[PDB]
């Protein structure tokens, strides 16, 4: 009963049994499972047309794309290089990230510092 | 891979030997991996040279030996859009400047050499003797 599941044509991403709020990667990418009532009167937990526009959830901060699903990898945004760290679609902020073998530093707001830093 | 974006551009214009003009580039808001943007010019007649770039959200520049010292490639700080600053025209410098976007090195760098992704329609600079 856990796990990514399309119900009357909606998606939904379980644990125990019901469904949970946040950026989850289903058989569809990383799609955001939203609360009730975010966009279009989506259901609790129901995947949401979500597009070309960052989320901050939880202090995380994520990169939606033209497909509503949230990007990965490195990403050149309005000026600024961003990392989503391929397992979580979250961007790298905070301090110093080992990406590839080579140190870099991003901002809170995820904004890739410029150079190298080990 | 590097999806082909739209590059627009504005500026350019007419001046007298020792002027000075601007060129503009935008491209699209969200481009994934990372991506080098300046330009390159050509006269028509003549082969495309690079004339500068630079690595968005990083900062490495590279420059024509021709133009070094007096054009400078800046971005802007809130968008994928880059500015030519062209400091003490030469009649030399008139061509047709096509804005360029292509993928920076593993290094984060950029070459000239080897592959632009997307042009621009191109800005002609003219500059009289």
């Known amino acids: 009963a856990n796990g990514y599941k399309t119900i009357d044509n909606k998606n939904f991403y379980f644990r125990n049994g019901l469904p949970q709020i946040g950026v989850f990667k289903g058989s569809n990418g990383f799609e955001y499972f939203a609360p009730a009532n975010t966009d279009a009167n989506n259901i609790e937990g129901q995947a949401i047309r979500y597009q070309n526009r960052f989320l901050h959830l939880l202090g995380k901060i994520y990169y939606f794309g033209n497909n509503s699903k949230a990007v990965t990898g490195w990403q050149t945004i309005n000026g600024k290089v961003y990392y989503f760290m391929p397992d979580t679609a979250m961007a790298a902020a905070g301090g110093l990230f080992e990406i590839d073998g080579v140190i870099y530093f991003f901002g809170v707001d995820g904004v890739k510092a410029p150079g190298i830093y080990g | 891979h590097m999806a082909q974006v739209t590059l627009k551009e504005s500026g350019g214009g007419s001046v007298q030997a020792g002027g000075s003009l601007r060129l503009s580039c935008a491209g699209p808001?969200?481009?994934?991996?990372?991506?080098?943007m300046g330009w390159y010019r050509q006269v028509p007649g003549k082969e495309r040279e690079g004339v500068a770039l630079?690595?968005?959200?990083?900062?490495?520049?590279n420059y024509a030996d021709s133009v070094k010292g007096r054009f400078t490639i800046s971005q802007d700080s809130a968008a994928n859009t880059v500015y030519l600053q062209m400091n003490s025209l030469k009649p030399e410098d008139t061509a047709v400047y096509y804005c360029?976007?292509?993928?920076?090195?593993?290094?984060?760098?950029?070459?000239?050499?080897?592959?632009?992704?997307?042009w621009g329609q191109g800005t002609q600079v003219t500059v009289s003797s």
């Open positions: 360029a976007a292509a993928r920076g090195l593993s290094d984060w760098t950029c070459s000239f050499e080897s592959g632009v992704n997307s």
């Open positions: 808001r969200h481009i994934p991996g990372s991506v080098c």
């Open positions: 630079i690595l968005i959200g990083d900062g490495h520049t």
